[PDB]
Scaffold this motif. Structure first.
Motif, short mmCIF file in Angstrom:
data_model
loop_
_atom_site.label_atom_id
_atom_site.label_comp_id
_atom_site.label_asym_id
_atom_site.label_seq_id
_atom_site.Cartn_x
_atom_site.Cartn_y
_atom_site.Cartn_z
N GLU A 107 0.83 -1.20 0.00
CA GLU A 107 0.00 0.00 0.00
C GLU A 107 0.86 1.25 0.00
OE1 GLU A 107 -0.96 -2.20 2.77
OE2 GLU A 107 -2.45 -3.27 1.56
N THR B 1 17.50 -1.44 1.77
CA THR B 1 17.06 -1.12 3.12
C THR B 1 16.93 -2.39 3.97
OG1 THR B 1 14.71 -1.20 2.52
CG2 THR B 1 15.84 0.93 2.34
N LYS B 42 9.10 -3.43 7.78
CA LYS B 42 8.85 -4.20 6.56
C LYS B 42 7.39 -4.60 6.48
CE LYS B 42 9.74 -8.70 4.46
NZ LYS B 42 9.90 -8.19 3.07
N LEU D 237 -9.66 -13.96 5.95
CA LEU D 237 -9.06 -12.83 5.24
C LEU D 237 -7.95 -12.14 6.03
CD1 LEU D 237 -12.09 -11.14 3.42
CD2 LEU D 237 -10.19 -12.42 2.43
N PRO D 238 -8.06 -11.94 7.35
CA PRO D 238 -6.93 -11.32 8.08
C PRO D 238 -5.63 -12.09 7.99
CG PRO D 238 -8.91 -11.10 9.34
CD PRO D 238 -9.24 -12.04 8.22
N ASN D 294 -11.57 -8.91 -1.41
CA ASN D 294 -10.86 -8.16 -0.38
C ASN D 294 -10.86 -6.66 -0.67
OD1 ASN D 294 -9.76 -8.40 2.14
ND2 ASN D 294 -7.70 -8.98 1.46
N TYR F 8 -8.85 -6.22 4.05
CA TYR F 8 -8.30 -6.95 5.19
C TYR F 8 -6.90 -7.45 4.88
CZ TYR F 8 -12.95 -7.29 7.33
OH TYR F 8 -14.17 -7.00 7.90
N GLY F 9 -6.24 -7.95 5.93
CA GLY F 9 -4.87 -8.40 5.80
C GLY F 9 -3.91 -7.23 5.91
N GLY F 10 -2.75 -7.38 5.28
CA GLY F 10 -1.81 -6.29 5.22
C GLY F 10 -0.91 -6.40 4.00
N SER F 11 0.07 -5.50 3.92
CA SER F 11 1.07 -5.52 2.87
C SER F 11 2.45 -5.46 3.51
CB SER F 11 0.90 -4.36 1.88
OG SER F 11 1.42 -3.16 2.42
N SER F 12 3.39 -6.20 2.94
CA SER F 12 4.76 -6.18 3.40
C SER F 12 5.62 -5.62 2.28
CB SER F 12 5.24 -7.58 3.80
OG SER F 12 4.38 -8.15 4.77
N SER F 13 6.60 -4.80 2.65
CA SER F 13 7.48 -4.21 1.66
C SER F 13 8.36 -5.28 1.04
CB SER F 13 8.34 -3.11 2.29
OG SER F 13 7.54 -2.03 2.73
N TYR F 14 8.53 -5.19 -0.28
CA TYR F 14 9.45 -6.10 -0.96
C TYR F 14 10.88 -5.58 -0.89
CZ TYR F 14 5.22 -8.27 -2.78
OH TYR F 14 4.01 -8.90 -2.90
N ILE F 16 12.26 -3.66 1.62
CA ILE F 16 12.81 -3.80 2.97
C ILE F 16 12.90 -5.27 3.34
CG2 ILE F 16 12.60 -3.02 5.35
CD1 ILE F 16 10.73 -0.83 4.38
N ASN F 17 14.10 -5.69 3.75
CA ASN F 17 14.34 -7.05 4.22
C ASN F 17 14.76 -7.02 5.69
OD1 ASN F 17 17.02 -6.19 4.13
ND2 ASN F 17 17.65 -7.63 2.53
N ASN F 18 14.45 -8.09 6.41
CA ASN F 18 14.83 -8.22 7.82
C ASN F 18 15.96 -9.24 7.92
OD1 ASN F 18 12.86 -6.39 8.52
ND2 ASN F 18 11.43 -7.91 9.34
N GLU F 19 17.07 -8.83 8.51
CA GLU F 19 18.22 -9.73 8.61
C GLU F 19 17.87 -10.93 9.48
OE1 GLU F 19 21.49 -10.32 7.36
OE2 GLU F 19 20.26 -9.22 5.91
N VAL F 21 17.72 -13.68 12.22
CA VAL F 21 18.19 -13.78 13.60
C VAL F 21 17.99 -15.21 14.06
CG1 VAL F 21 16.03 -13.03 14.61
CG2 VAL F 21 18.13 -12.78 15.91
#
Ligand SMILES: CCCCCCCCCCCCCCCCCC(=O)OC[C@H](COP(=O)([O-])OCC(O)COP(=O)([O-])OC[C@@H](COC(=O)CCCCCCCCCCCCCCCCC)OC(=O)CCCCCCCCCCCCCCCCC)OC(=O)CCCCCCCCCCCCCCCCC
Ligand SMILES: CCCCCCCCCCCCCCCCCC(=O)OC[C@H](COP(=O)([O-])OCC(O)COP(=O)([O-])OC[C@@H](COC(=O)CCCCCCCCCCCCCCCCC)OC(=O)CCCCCCCCCCCCCCCCC)OC(=O)CCCCCCCCCCCCCCCCC
Ligand SMILES: CCCCCCCCCCCCCCCCCC(=O)O[C@@H](COC(=O)CCCCCCCCCCCCCCC)COP(=O)(O)OCC[N+](C)(C)C
Ligand SMILES: CCCCCCCCCCCCCCCCCC(=O)O[C@@H](COC(=O)CCCCCCCCCCCCCCC)COP(=O)(O)OCC[N+](C)(C)C
Ligand SMILES: CCCCCCCCCCCCCCCCCC(=O)O[C@@H](COC(=O)CCCCCCCCCCCCCCC)COP(=O)(O)OCC[N+](C)(C)C
Ligand SMILES: CCCCCCCCCCCCCCCCCCCC(=O)O[C@H](COC(=O)CCCCCCCCCCCCCC)COP(=O)(O)OCCN
Ligand SMILES: CCCCCCCCCCCCCCCCCCCC(=O)O[C@H](COC(=O)CCCCCCCCCCCCCC)COP(=O)(O)OCCN
Ligand SMILES: CCCCCCCCCCCCCCCCCCCC(=O)O[C@H](COC(=O)CCCCCCCCCCCCCC)COP(=O)(O)OCCN
Ligand SMILES: CCCCCCCCCCCCCCCCCCCC(=O)O[C@H](COC(=O)CCCCCCCCCCCCCC)COP(=O)(O)OCCN
Ligand SMILES: CCCCCCCCCCCCCCCCCCCC(=O)O[C@H](COC(=O)CCCCCCCCCCCCCC)COP(=O)(O)OCCN
Lengths: 111, 155, 127, 438, 536, 51
Positions: A107, B1, B42, D237-238, D294, F8-14, F16-19, F21
């Motif tokens: 988004e 990043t 992220k 959906l979540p 959605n 609903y749900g979400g979005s994750s950045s492509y 940005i990466n998380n190292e 652990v």
């Protein structure tokens, strides 16, 4: 030969011993038919006359599978167009073999 | 990043502090935030407090957008009804603004699978302009119509 | 007398019913009818589908002959002995915008090619 | 919220202490009290709390209950429709079974824990086996069908819930978790696939509805099918959005195929109850597809259409039950002259059938418009496919109405005072929702 | 003031159909005509205010009828010049039909319900015409569709009437589905449902095709005309309303309100429907059928004229308003003839002493249909034929349709009056009350006023045509009328039979489309759910 | 989201990466690796040998 079962005043009693037939809910039932009843039975129990024949397989595959294939192909085309329209990279769909991991657009990101 | 675990835990502690500051004073408009919680996560789901607050901000914004679009539609309808036959020339601007509002409202939270709402055919007109420029410069013959001055009452 | 006219009652079923008896509509009056008239049984006028198709084959060319000439054989320059209605520049430019307009066929105009390409527009929205 | 849950727990409790002769009166009063408590819950739900209007926990993650947009509408629908079911049912055994089923269903809607959701919805498994398989009017085949389909789907959902509880450490909706696993998504999805009838897993529904009592059929179509949409919005959906987007061409294929095949199957039906059951299966497809997009337009449209169906299908099932009581037949071929013989039953039947066809003054129209708009937002072809095939519903409904409308009949089979009383709330609610108070 | 008309019709519907036990047959014979008279007074005020004095008004009843996210529509009524003209025509015809039904339906058990359905039908037509947004139009479109289903199938113990109603319902479902798709396209890319913002200079072909497919349903064009001929099963008052105004006109109204049509398609489809309808009407032997085919032909003319020029929309609406009066008169007179003779066949009609008013009204309506010079029908039809000359294809077909129209109309007039008596020597009679005379007075008044006031602003504007080309419609009409009086044979028995079977569109649907539909249903159910997937 | 306004749900950045652990400081594995026999049998190189 008939009598009124219902009493509005509330003093309703079932005269089970009355010579005359009560005009109860059973008075208005429709008379069944021996042949209609057998037709109803045959229609419901139509699995008994099912037979696996080449014509049956042909008809099933051509209409049910054919519609399912057409519907999948159309949905795949629409997804491809939307991806091109939106400017998103080719999405990793389930059966599509794509060397891209894109699924849900970010988004925050501007496409 | 890249985000190191130290930075992630630091942000988590800051988020907890933000929650504690919000909790100190009662607010009836807690779930109608006027500002988002800025982050470089992220995934927003990592910090639950940020996720819920930002979602509530997004809902507030979308409600506001829907009402703004209704207001724009009302001024366009009044303008159209006042001018008469001069509506096409005089109501181009109001219509342009209304269509822009419709796009903003629909496009902001269209969803994962929804396409962009091309109110006013701006994207189609742009695409046709690019196709024309390319065909003309490369000497190709375009099988598509040339771009239009006006395609709708506004856009 | 519109009301109270005599009617014949359809005889009660007395033999095993066919599996596809739902194709017959019977309300209890004697003349029952198929679900769609002409699907089976007597055909109106004793005319089969083949007869109707042969008729349409005879008729179709004669009906299509006027339309095919003007639409295909004829061209904008030769269709009519006059040009489309002439308008002032401000009016004409606005009128030319309409895809379903009548000013797009003015060959005399120096914008004819663009107008013709506008008339033959997009089949479906690009976005 | 607390008042609603308490009234819900009191309704099964009240039966244990009643005189066994006052059972029906007490049950009706309890149902009305539960409706009033639901209205109170609506009053105490502020729109300012955008995410969850109210959340209550009673000492554990399992006892976490809360109301959202979907939950609020479904809970109000269940409380609105239960009194009708209560009055239609006679006998302590029947009342006990119905009240237990209702309590389990109403507790499932407000549950926010997947494991608690499963515990409450599937508790009413034997009760449906016993209800659909009753001594004289029930069919063992239908009971076995519904029970086995429910057990297999809910077990898959349970396995997915166990993995989510192991991996994340919690399975409560209020804790934000995301999963990209396809096995877990499929496990959660299969329950939705079966509960909301979708081809080819829709066979259990028609059998159950035909051999269920009118109170059971009304409850089933009215709210039991809706429990799928609560699971989708709250538990699928979540967490599994990525898998719905990955499989969207397949989801669309299965939903459209369900809509088409169900419509075609409705054409070969000679039993009124089977016609209403297959109409429900066809109607569920639009709701499922709209939610799967959605988008705001889709989730709202799906919930609205669900309410419209939960107001139109109970009406048709109630009228069918009244007709069957009057005539002891459900065969359209035996029922003729109903227009002349039952002008009052016929008027309501025609009104409800018009509602089922999504005419403008009915809630179905507004709901369909919103759902179609959501599909058009996704793709124009998606909307067109659904809009075009809607004519098949018209063909079967028109044929049924025409067969029932005229002919020769010697029996006056019209509704009594009790029958009009039972449909009046449904008629008023349909009208109010139709005029835009959705 | 503008709302009052819709209120009066819906009140008359609710009163007659919910409180008819109290009102009685006589009560419906009062409340119906009274309400329609009041609605006529309101419609006349609306017409004067909007059409003559150029004052459009918008009445928003309530907001947020549908409020889901971005999608927002309101119940609003905009009385524009098209709306005022159609409102006036619809209410005038409905008031006449209500007056007519007092005597015609006395022999029918549910006269209260009939009057209720007629008033609800008129109300939904006024909702469709006056809607300011596409959703209100859809509400009207569906309401007229349902009222037609409830009115065509009024005789339930006749399998033909119920089948005719099912046919209407299914065809109208296919059309309103195409309309819903087009409205979704228009909302998505323009942002609103209101006609003011709906304006789009260039529209993708798909939307144009969907709009046309939606319109061809109500305005029975080719491939979608099967229901109109069948709709003759219903009582005569229903046929007058549907054919003259409520149903056939809606498609044209939609096309004229939103000019998204394509010139190439509308011209060909219209000219084809005009010719086919005239040919079908030539073979027809039922009085009510011939007038239905005439309606189809006239609709073809109105659809065809949109292609010819920019003023085609004005010319089409002008023909529509002129046509509603004479066509209504033709149906009401046909009904009275049928009632008086107890016969529906043209062969058994003949000269017989009757009422002067009915015979004159029939003659004048037939003359308007024929194209007799200096009549309302003539001006509205010449405006079309003269302006269609530019399109060589459309013009030739429309002239041929004018010939066939004249031939059947003259044949019908000769058969009903000039011909010797053809019915049996039995006592038959239908006495006409003063209410029927008032109804014919109203229709004749509409016909007379149309000549003085006209139908379009551009009606008498000069079409720059040679004299021979301008006056040809008259010669073709006269030639057809003369050939029709002589009752000559025009086609071989093979073609007369073909035209009697209406082109075999319904035989094609039954043999192929219906069989395919029920084979798909057989595969879907018997072979699959209750065969392969059903346990022993 | 549990609302009707946003997806609903979400979005994750492509980007940005998380190292990564480690789950724990010291990892002890009680799962044995595949045997040489398993790999030999699984080898499909030579069809006759595999069969
Ligand atoms: C402190 C101040 C005081 C205030 C009060 C507060 C106290 C709180 C609670 C106290 C209330 C008393 C509890 C009742 C105990 C007896 C109830 C009973 O026997 O049922 C039938 C009985 C009717 O008796 P009957 O008509 O005279 O004839 C029965 C004959 O004995 C035999 O007849 P039959 O042979 O013909 O059998 C026919 C059978 C048809 O055959 C079947 O269908 C068998 C099906 C198997 C079980 C059904 C599976 C599904 C049940 C789901 C649970 C229902 C609630 C749904 C909510 C979801 C919960 C997750 O049909 C039925 O029996 C009724 C059908 C539906 C009832 C099933 C529900 C009962 C579940 C277990 C009962 C408890 C027994 C414990 C035993 C204790 C010592 C022995 O009672 C009822 O009125 C209906 C049931 C009331 C249910 C409330 C009981 C709580 C159970 C819910 C579980 C939640 C955990 C417990 C916590 C509760 C709160 C702490
Ligand atoms: C689509 C294209 C057209 C569709 C069909 C066209 C031709 C179909 C060709 C297949 C066929 O002829 O099937 C007939 C045949 C039944 O024989 P029958 O001649 O009907 O009579 C024998 C009985 O006595 C019959 O006695 P009965 O009457 O008492 O039993 C009737 C039973 C008999 O039914 C069955 O036994 C199988 C029922 C489902 C078959 C599953 C897929 C079969 C076809 C799918 C692909 C076809 C493309 C070709 O039907 C049922 O009641 C069960 C159905 C209820 C559950 C509904 C679930 C439906 C799932 C898929 C529906 C099928 C797709 C069509 C709709 C499309 C919607 C997506 O069915 C099968 O044998 C199944 C074939 C494939 C099964 C899936 C693979 C099994 C996996 C086993 C792996 C081995 C594991 C190794 C370890 C073992 C140790 C544990
Ligand atoms: C067995 C039955 C026997 C009894 C029959 C009962 C007769 C019923 C009479 C029919 C009612 C017709 C009135 C239709 C309008 C509905 C009234 C209404 O909804 O009230 C509106 C106020 O609006 C009105 O009062 C409308 C005026 C009604 C009368 C005006 C003209 C009457 C002619 C009827 C034509 C109406 C066409 C509307 C089509 C949608 C509420 O105002 P808001 O605060 O804006 O509500 C929010 C909007 N929403 C509902 C969507 C949430
Ligand atoms: C939009 C703003 C205002 C809305 C007013 C709408 C007009 C009145 C609506 C009244 C209620 C709507 C539906 C009524 C129930 C549906 C049943 C019905 O209409 O007719 C019943 C019975 O009618 C009634 O008792 C009630 C009708 C009273 C008023 C009906 C007016 C016409 C209905 C309007 C259509 C509804 C619109 C829905 C879609 C837009 C059945 O009639 P038939 O099947 O033809 O059989 C009758 C016997 N016979 C064979 C002899 C013909
Ligand atoms: C090519 C199609 C182009 C346009 C499509 C529009 C209409 C296509 C077919 C029209 C069918 C509608 C007619 C109808 O419903 O009436 C039937 C009712 O028939 C049925 O209900 C049977 C079902 C037919 C409906 C659909 C069948 C055709 C489907 C089209 C394609 C099939 C599958 C394609 C995609 C699903 C009554 O029959 P009649 O005897 O003629 O009644 C007239 C009255 N009178 C007695 C006086 C003659
Ligand atoms: C044993 C079980 C099965 C056995 C029998 C199966 C027989 C069925 C075979 C044909 C069925 C219909 C044909 C559809 C698939 C054709 C070939 C698939 C390959 C394909 O995707 O090509 C696309 C087909 O066009 C399309 O996108 C779809 C066009 C056809 C859809 C419309 C036809 C009927 C409409 C009825 C409504 C159904 C859909 C409703 C939404 C166009 O190629 P591409 O440009 O996409 O490139 C994509 C890269 N290959
Ligand atoms: C002015 C605009 C045009 C308006 C209408 C134009 C229609 C023109 C189409 C007809 C002309 C071409 C016909 C195809 C050539 C067939 C020649 C002979 C026909 C034949 O032998 O078989 C027939 C096939 O039906 C058929 O021929 C059906 C094919 C028709 C194609 C679909 C087009 C829609 C038709 C709608 C109206 C046409 C009515 C008459 C066709 C009858 O078959 P059978 O039943 O005897 O077989 C036995 C059952 N086992
Ligand atoms: C004088 C006496 C009058 C006699 C008859 C009149 C009866 C009531 C007339 C007006 C009252 C309308 C309320 C009915 C439902 C409206 C619910 C509603 O729209 O508000 C929603 C509340 O959220 C919610 O969650 C509400 C949930 C409860 C609503 C009912 C659920 C169905 C229960 C059974 C149906 C019967 C309904 C009656 C949010 O609306 P929004 O956020 O979407 O925005 C609004 C634009 N759409
Ligand atoms: C690693 C493993 C490899 C694969 C190996 C697979 C081997 C077998 C797996 C099958 C498991 C499915 C369990 C259902 C079995 C079918 C039902 C039994 C048939 C039956 O006769 O049941 C009768 C009624 O059942 C009914 O009426 C029910 C009708 C059919 C139920 C439909 C099944 C539910 C949906 C199926 C799949 C859905 C999603 C799958 C993910 C009751 O018989 P009785 O009491 O009279 O006993 C008397 C003895 N004959
Ligand atoms: C053939 C058409 C497919 C029929 C399904 C139609 C619509 C269902 C869509 C449901 C939406 C969410 C479900 C997610 C995936 C399920 C099916 C997606 C299609 C699929 O099978 O993709 C496979 C991957 O999915 C998987 O690996 C998992 C497949 C499902 C497992 C089956 C039973 C699992 C039950 C487990 C119970 C709970 C377990 C929880 C621990 C292989 O596709 P690919 O990516 O490898 O492409 C390589 C091709 N060249």
């Amino acid at each position: 030969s008939s009598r009124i079962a219902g009493d509005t005043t509330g003093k309703y009693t079932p005269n089970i011993f009355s010579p005359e037939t009560p005009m109860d809910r059973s008075f208005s039932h429709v008379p069944k038919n021996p042949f209609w009843e057998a037709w109803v039975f045959r229609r419901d129990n139509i699995q008994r006359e099912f037979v696996w024949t080449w014509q049956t397989i042909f008809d099933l595959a051509t209409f049910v599978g054919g519609l399912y294939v057409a519907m999948y192909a159309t949905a795949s085309f629409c997804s491809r167009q939307n991806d091109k329209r939106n400017g998103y990279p080719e999405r990793n769909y389930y059966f599509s073999d794509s060397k891209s991991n894109f699924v849900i657009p970010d988004e925050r990101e501007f496409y | 990043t890249t985000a190191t675990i130290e930075e992630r835990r630091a942000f988590h502690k800051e988020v907890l502090d933000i929650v504690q500051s919000k909790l100190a004073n009662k607010n009836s408009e807690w779930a109608r935030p006027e500002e988002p919680i800025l982050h470089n996560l992220k995934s927003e789901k990592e910090e639950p407090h940020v996720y819920y607050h930002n979602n509530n901000f997004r809902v507030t914004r979308q409600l506001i957008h829907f009402e703004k679009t209704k207001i724009f539609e009302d001024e366009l309808d009044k303008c159209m009804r006042t001018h008469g036959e001069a509506k096409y020339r005089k109501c181009q601007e109001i219509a342009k603004r209304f269509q822009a509002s419709c796009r903003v409202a629909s496009n902001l939270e269209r969803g994962p699978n929804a396409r962009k709402r091309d109110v006013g055919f701006i994207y189609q007109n742009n695409k046709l302009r690019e196709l024309e420029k390319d065909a003309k410069e490369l000497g190709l013959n375009n099988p598509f119509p040339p771009s239009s001055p006006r395609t709708t009452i506004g856009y | 007398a519109g009301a109270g006219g005599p009617v014949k009652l359809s005889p009660p079923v007395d033999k095993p019913l066919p599996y596809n008896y739902d194709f017959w509509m019977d309300n209890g009056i004697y003349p029952g009818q198929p679900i769609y008239d002409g699907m089976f049984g007597s055909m109106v006028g004793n005319m089969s589908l083949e007869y109707m198709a042969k008729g349409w084959l005879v008729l179709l060319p004669i009906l299509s002959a006027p339309f095919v000439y003007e639409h295909c054989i004829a061209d904008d320059v030769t269709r009519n002995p006059f040009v489309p209605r002439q308008y002032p520049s401000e009016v004409r430019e606005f009128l030319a915008l309409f895809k379903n307009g009548f000013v797009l066929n003015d060959y005399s105009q120096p914008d004819y090619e663009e107008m013709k390409r506008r008339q033959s527009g997009l089949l479906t929205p690009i976005y | 919220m607390s008042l609603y849950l308490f009234m819900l727990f009191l309704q099964p409790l009240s039966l244990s202490f009643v005189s066994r002769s006052f059972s029906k009166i007490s049950s009706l009063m309890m149902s009305f009290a539960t409706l009033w408590s639901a209205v109170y819950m609506w009053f105490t739900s502020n729109g300012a709390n955008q995410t969850f209007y109210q959340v209550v926990s009673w000492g554990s993650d399992w006892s976490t209950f809360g109301v959202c947009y979907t939950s609020l509408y479904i809970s109000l629908l269940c409380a609105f429709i239960f009194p009708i079911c209560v009055i239609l049912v006679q006998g302590y055994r029947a009342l006990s079974i119905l009240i237990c089923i209702q309590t389990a269903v109403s507790l499932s809607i407000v549950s926010l824990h997947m494991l608690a959701f499963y515990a409450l919805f599937e508790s009413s498994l034997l009760l449906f086996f016993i209800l659909i398989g009753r001594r004289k009017y029930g069919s063992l085949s239908a009971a076995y069908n519904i029970s086995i389909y429910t057990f297999i789907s809910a077990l898959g959902f349970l396995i997915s819930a166990f993995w989510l509880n192991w991996s994340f450490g919690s399975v409560c909706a209020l804790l934000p978790n995301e999963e990209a696993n396809s096995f877990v998504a499929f496990g959660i999805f299969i329950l939705l696939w079966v509960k909301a009838p979708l081809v080819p897993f829709h066979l259990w529904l028609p059998e159950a509805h035909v051999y269920a009592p009118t109170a059971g059929s009304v409850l089933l179509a009215g709210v039991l099918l809706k429990i799928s949409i609560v699971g989708l919005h709250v538990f699928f959906l979540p967490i599994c959005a990525s898998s719905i987007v990955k499989a969207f061409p397949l989801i669309l294929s299965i939903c459209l195929g369900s809509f088409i095949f169900s419509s075609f199957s409705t054409l070969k039906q000679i039993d009124l109850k089977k016609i209403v059951a297959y109409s429900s299966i066809s109607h569920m497809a639009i709701v499922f597809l709209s939610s799967a997009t959605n988008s705001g337009l889709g989730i709202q449209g799906a919930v609205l259409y669900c309410i419209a169906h939960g107001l139109i299908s109970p009406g048709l099932f109630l009228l069918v039950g009244i007709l069957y009581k009057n005539t002891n037949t459900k065969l359209v071929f035996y029922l003729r002259g109903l227009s002349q013989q039952a002008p009052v039953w016929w008027s309501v039947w025609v009104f409800f059938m018009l509602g089922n066809l999504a005419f403008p003054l009915f809630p179905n129209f507004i709901a369909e418009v919103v759902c179609l708009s959501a599909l058009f937002k996704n793709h124009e072809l998606y909307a067109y496919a659904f809009i075009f095939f809607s004519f098949v519903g018209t063909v079967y409904s028109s044929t049924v109405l025409g067969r029932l409308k005229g002919g020769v009949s010697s029996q006056c089979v019209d509704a009594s005072r009790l029958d009009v009383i039972s449909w009046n709330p449904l008629v008023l609610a349909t009208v109010v929702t139709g005029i835009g108070y959705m | 003031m503008f709302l009052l008309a819709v209120y009066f019709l819906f009140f008359s519907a609710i009163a007659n159909g919910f409180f008819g036990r109290y009102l009685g047959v006589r009560g419906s014979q009062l409340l119906g005509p009274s309400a329609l008279f009041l609605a006529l007074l309101c419609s006349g005020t609306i017409f004067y205010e909007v059409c003559i004095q150029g004052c459009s008004t918008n009445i928003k009843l309530f907001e947020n009828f549908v409020y889901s996210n971005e999608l927002n529509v309101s119940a609003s009524f905009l009385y524009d010049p098209l709306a005022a003209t159609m409102t006036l025509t619809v209410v005038w015809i409905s008031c006449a039909v209500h007056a007519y039904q007092n005597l015609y339906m006395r022999g029918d058990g549910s006269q209260t319900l009939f009057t209720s359905y007629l008033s609800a039908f008129t109300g939904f037509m006024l909702i469709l015409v006056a809607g300011q947004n596409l959703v209100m139009l859809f509400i009207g479109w569906e309401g007229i569709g349902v009222c037609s289903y409830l009115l065509i199938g009024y005789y339930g113990s006749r399998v033909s009437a119920v089948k005719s109603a099912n046919k209407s319902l299914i065809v109208n479902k296919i059309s309103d589905g195409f309309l819903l798709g087009s409205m979704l396209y228009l909302w998505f890319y323009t942002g609103s449902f209101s006609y003011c913002s709906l304006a789009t200079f260039q529209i993708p072909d798909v939307v144009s095709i969907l709009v046309l497919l939606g319109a061809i349903g109500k305005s029975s064009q080719l491939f979608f005309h099967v229901w109109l001929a069948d709709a003759m099963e219903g009582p005569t008052p229903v046929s007058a309303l549907i054919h003259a105004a409520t149903l056939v006109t809606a498609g044209i109204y939609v096309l004229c309100k939103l000019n998204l049509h394509s010139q190439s398609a509308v011209g060909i489809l219209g000219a084809a429907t005009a010719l086919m309808g005239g040919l079908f009407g030539l073979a027809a032997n039922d009085l009510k059928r011939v007038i239905a085919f005439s309606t189809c032909s006239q609709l073809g003319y109105m659809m065809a004229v949109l292609s010819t020029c920019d003023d085609g929309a004005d010319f089409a609406m002008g023909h529509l308003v002129s046509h509603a009066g004479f066509k209504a008169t033709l149906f009401l007179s046909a009904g009275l003839s049928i009632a008086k003779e107890n016969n529906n066949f043209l062969n058994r009609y003949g000269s017989r002493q009757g009422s002067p008013t009915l015979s004159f009204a029939t003659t004048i309506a037939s003359l308007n249909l024929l194209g007799f010079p200096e009549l309302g029908g003539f001006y509205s039809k010449e405006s079309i034929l003269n302006n269609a000359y530019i399109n060589q294809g459309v013009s030739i077909i429309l002239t041929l349709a004018t010939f066939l129209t004249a031939f059947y109309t003259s044949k019908v007039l000769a058969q009903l009056y000039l011909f010797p008596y053809g019915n049996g020597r039995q006592q038959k009679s239908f006495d006409i009350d003063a209410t029927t005379l008032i109804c014919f007075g109203l229709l004749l008044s509409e016909m007379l006023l149309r000549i003085f006031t006209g139908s379009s602003l551009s009606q008498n504007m000069t079409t720059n045509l040679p004299a021979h080309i301008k006056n040809l419609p008259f010669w073709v009409a006269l030639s057809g009328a003369l050939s029709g009086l002589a009752t000559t044979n025009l086609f071989s028995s093979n073609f007369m039979r073909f035209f009697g079977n209406r082109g075999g569109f319904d035989v094609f649907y039954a043999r192929k489309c219906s069989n395919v539909f029920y084979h798909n249903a057989y595969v879907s159910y018997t072979l699959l759910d209750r065969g392969f997937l059903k346990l022993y | 989201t549990f609302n009707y306004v946003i997806p609903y749900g979400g979005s994750s950045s492509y980007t940005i990466n998380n190292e990564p652990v480690k789950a724990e400081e010291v990892t002890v594995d009680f799962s044995k690796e595949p045997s040489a026999s398993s790999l030999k049998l699984a080898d499909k190189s030579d069809w006759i040998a595999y069969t």
